[PDB]
Design a protein around this ligand. Sequence first.
Ligand SMILES: CC(=O)Nc1cccc(NC(N)=O)c1
Length: 166
Amino acid sequence: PKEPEQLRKLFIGGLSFETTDESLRSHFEQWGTLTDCVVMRDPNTKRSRGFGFVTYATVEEVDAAMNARPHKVDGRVVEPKRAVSHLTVKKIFVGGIKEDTEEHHLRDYFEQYGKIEVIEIMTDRGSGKKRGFAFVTFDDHDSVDKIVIQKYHTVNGHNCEVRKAL
Ligand SMILES: CC(=O)Nc1cccc(NC(N)=O)c1
């Protein structure tokens, strides 16, 4: 069974107006099989709108393309992002971790999604007791985008609620 097409798409902003369906495809085919590749254009003038999208055959190919950023396409650094499920943030809320979850539990799990810059385990302002939630800040938004599309996150035995923060 194929992964849903929405999860295989990359929206590419910041295109050179000279980028075409063919040149966008030639570039992004370096990281996987493209089932679709389109530059958005004005319906009357045919002038590029400066963005487009590519669809890979698999999610692992999307990952490969994102891991190969920055992408310079036809002389311009472009801005690839996964399809919306865009609220482009580098921080997540992690809820449901209870009182026994520590920094290393969160680091060991989340470091496989991206490079972590900050882990903040929330504690009660009055007592110092753990409140059962945390924030994790990454160096890049794609980590967050991969995280929030998963149905489940299991950390320290807890089934966690994870959402984009701020
Ligand atoms: C690669 C990536 O996610 N960059 C990004 C995303 C959101 C905000 C900012 N802002 C900033 N000053 O760093 C940067």
